[PDB]
Amino acid sequence: GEKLKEVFLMLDNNVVECIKEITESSRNGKLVFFVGAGVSTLSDYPQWWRLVDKYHEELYGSPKKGNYSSDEYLRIPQIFYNVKGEMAFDGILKDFFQVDKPTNPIHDKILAMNPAHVITTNYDNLIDTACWKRGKYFSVISAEEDVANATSSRYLLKVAGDFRKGFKGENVVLKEDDYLNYDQNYPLISNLMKTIIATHTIVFIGYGLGDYNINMLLNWVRKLQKDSFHKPFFIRTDPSPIENETLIYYENKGLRIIDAASLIDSNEYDYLERYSAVMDLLIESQENKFITKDDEVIDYIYGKISPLFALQYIRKIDLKHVFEYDYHFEVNGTVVRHKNKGFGYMERFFELKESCDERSKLSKKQYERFNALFNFFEKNGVICMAKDAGTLNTSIEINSLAYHGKYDVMKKFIEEQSVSIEDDYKKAFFLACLGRWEESYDLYSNIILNSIDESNGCVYYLSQINRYRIYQSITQAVTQFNHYKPFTDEFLARIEREMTNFNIDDLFNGMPFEFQKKYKILEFLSDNQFLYDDTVKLFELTNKVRMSSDIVVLLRLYDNLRFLYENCLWSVSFHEFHQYIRNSMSLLIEKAEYEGFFMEYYDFVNISRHFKIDDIKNLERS
């Protein structure tokens, strides 16, 4: 790990930017590995000039006096197939490919970046079984009815073919005319290959750089326009370092060559250390093992948090998810390491937070990032580390006019002119609180229509959710009430006409990767239920005693209700959250009865708001 650290610190600009692009192209889920023969060779799988030599032994009688070229690699099978036949051919493929080699380590490293598809030209089950054992189902395609029955979103496109539906010759591209009428006998695999190439990030692994198929792709990308496609990355693992004229030529043809010989010191047959040099330089890049200076610290945290600036409050739970469980955030505002196996970046963030001269020797842009992250983490309550956890209070400040009660201020705020879309979002929530639900529905409709054409569309999403939830409150409102007439029938036909079978599941999987990677945490708002984990810690309260747990569930109730009211979410007004406050406050009063529990203003509001009268009656008599 120190060796790849020093190798990483001794990289030029081009290679390290290539590792950045494969890293973020991994994190976007837009990565496709295009492995070839050299991947299988590491895992001891049979090569092809051996079988060509076998063909030579049965066709010419002797081995080859010397060396072939690429065409005789394509031809001694074709001569074999035209003289001996298909039966001897399929028999040789049978006893030469029923030999079951294992996988190599880089197979698991292939799957360490979450590839979408895997487009191999190999015909082994090794990447297959690495994906089976791995836990990623790639729906295997080697013929055309396999394209028609391509099952998952994640394919396993064997361009050459495979040997699952038989150790035959038709199943795979081996012989000469298999490489000659490829566009007539495999058309759908060809178009699917070129589509997956054009949409994803293609990372060639098991390939030399002369490689007939690589030349076919470079002729094809030569046919494409300039800057229409993403350039395929090429992990080159030849023993010699590449000549820079070759590198200039193939970088201009469209490859982005990550050479392994020019990256790590290796021997002549030292392939697995070259492949694993590149693959683990990628993996140790994406696991934040390479962050050194403060600039990459303040940038990384900004890359996880400058999404969430558009939200008014973020729970500690949501920050735990948005840092990918690397730091379990304790609800008093402190930080615990949970899975961070790279550079400690939160600790460097608090070290810059403490020492002013350390943030003083920072670049001005990253100093502005540090001010933004600073105002963030002080606004949300994340104060220090667990080490630096000294004197701390647990005061909650829910600065929303709907939660404190104040109605006339909400009526004044509704009757103003909105200078923003977020002001229309808060006005839509206050209209939802004051009963005027038709006007709130129409206002969320206007927010949706006015914030389609906008980046970081969380206000679009939360108006989408709150539109559908105020739709649910209107529908179950007129279902339990229908006395008085709440809403007219024409608006009811309007929302039954618009809000038809609104797939709430597909809504989160419906966003331009800015609401897929950046605001991943808001996925629970597409879920109908989202307080089940918090309910489980209420089951700690009643894994009965009939950092203390009581303050943990108070501060987590405060995290929830502050997240729901300050983000102006109508989801606070529902069956799940009302029963969540009933159960939380009920079990807290009962446990505190078993062992204080001085109630401040907020808990008075929670009991006065969320309970019914028989709740205070029952906890009065009990």
Add this chain to the structure above:
Amino acid sequence: LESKRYGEKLKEVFLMLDNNVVECIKEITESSRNGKLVFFVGAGVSTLSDYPQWWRLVDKYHEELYGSPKKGNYSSDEYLRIPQIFYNVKGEMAFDGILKDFFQVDKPTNPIHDKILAMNPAHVITTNYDNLIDTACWKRGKYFSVISAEEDVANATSSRYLLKVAGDFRKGFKGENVVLKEDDYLNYDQNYPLISNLMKTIIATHTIVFIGYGLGDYNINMLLNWVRKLQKDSFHKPFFIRTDPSPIENETLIYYENKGLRIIDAASLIDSNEYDYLERYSAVMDLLIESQENKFITKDDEVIDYIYGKISPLFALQYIRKIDLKHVFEYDYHFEVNGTVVRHKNKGFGYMERFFELKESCDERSKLSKKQYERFNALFNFFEKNGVICMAKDAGTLNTSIEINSLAYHGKYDVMKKFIEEQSVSIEDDYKKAFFLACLGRWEESYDLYSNIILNSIDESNGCVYYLSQINRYRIYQSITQAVTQFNGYKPFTDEFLARIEREMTNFNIDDLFNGMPFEFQKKYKILEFLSDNQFLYDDTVKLFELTNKVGMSSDIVVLLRLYDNLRFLYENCLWSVSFHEFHQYIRNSMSLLIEKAEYERTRDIDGFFMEYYDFVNISRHFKIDDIKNLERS
């Protein structure tokens, strides 16, 4: 008014269909239910929603190029040319200006736009350049990531595209953005290559339903030349909703069916006038929608087949909860936990009611075909095994006895040791042996056995036993890892097997596992999606919150029978997920709150809960000692 006459009208139209059209509606219906549907709409869709047509703009071009309107009618090439002459004489600026003031006119959507989105299309490949299908998808709730140029293919975001083959006017009312002029249709394969390959890929993978198209339609001819280049039976034939006013001549239908289309004619389906387009489009679209909503089921054969199509998946499971049956019938019948059936969303033919009518009347099932009689016997043994007895109407005398016939739940260990030490004639016997090995502590052998079940049941259809061995492999992996984490860190497991499961069970994405199956474990066993979820008892926990939204079907029996549904589903299906934190706390909370409430309705006697064998086992098994201590003193 309209919907009654209308629904009965499409009912009679459906009953007066030939074989070919009704099979086409079946294929678009199941191709909708598989999520493999793509609508390929064209100009005639936009015209219904009052959008400007193209010979009007060609006439505008004629008015600015020739001065007069056209003396008569053009053909297809002059439709392609008077813009190109305009662009070569006037320029790009007058061209983009005419496209500006002729396409900033905001027409609305039509009703069939929502009907397009009623089948859950994956992609929408329009040749239109309007925002109407777009805004129908915005308002609809389906985000289709819009592609009209090539960097849009590169930044194609969701799995669901909106492929505008011609182009669009969001990045400008320009001429380069769209395919309108002649060379836009001439160097299409050099200027739009990636859109072309993406079109042909989406055509080859999905079910393509042409809507807004005439049948001569240059682009349709381009696709028919392309599918002429393909092999025989390599592709699925594109459906063609034809809405010309005249009925199609059968020679034309023979020719274009042979070229590769599957023509659903609208004029030969409904009686309509000459400019009666929206009733023709809506005839086809609502014949599709009223087919998929089971509004067309008449005979008993389609009843017993439909239920079999939802249940013959679930035969491979040993027990199915009432909740899972509610999901597998798509909420059409809310199943009550005493075994009765309540209509919840069934807006088509009552098929469960016909099923129980065949269940009651033996002479009614006697006049059934022999194959569907065998289906009825299989569904019968199913619904009597799971407990679904009658309707809510037919709910008369009924008991609520539970029968958990699993050797792990009743306790019996020596019988499990004997059953482990036998020879397994099946894979499911290896699955039950793997679960019993998991119960008896031998977790290394259970892990290796689930590994063998996975390796031996890759090459098999209806792989729920594959999936549940996958889940139980990962959960027995979790029990080994948190087992050695709470006990270590006696010697439970060797270090080499620990490096073996850390080497194999690396970052196993439990989320992707359900979205990892050959559509037989995606549509058929959709309900087992909650087993890919770490938590699955939250809804049942909410009805425990009814018990502590505190105190004719009583709620107490409902939560007893639902606990019985859960624990029977977890033990009879040999799921190791029963042995975990969620389910142990679920039994602690359920039995705790039931004993406390039953104490309360003992407590107000100011002027019950007899436990049988199973509840004794639940308290003896799932509790800890301080649980019976605390409920003893309380």
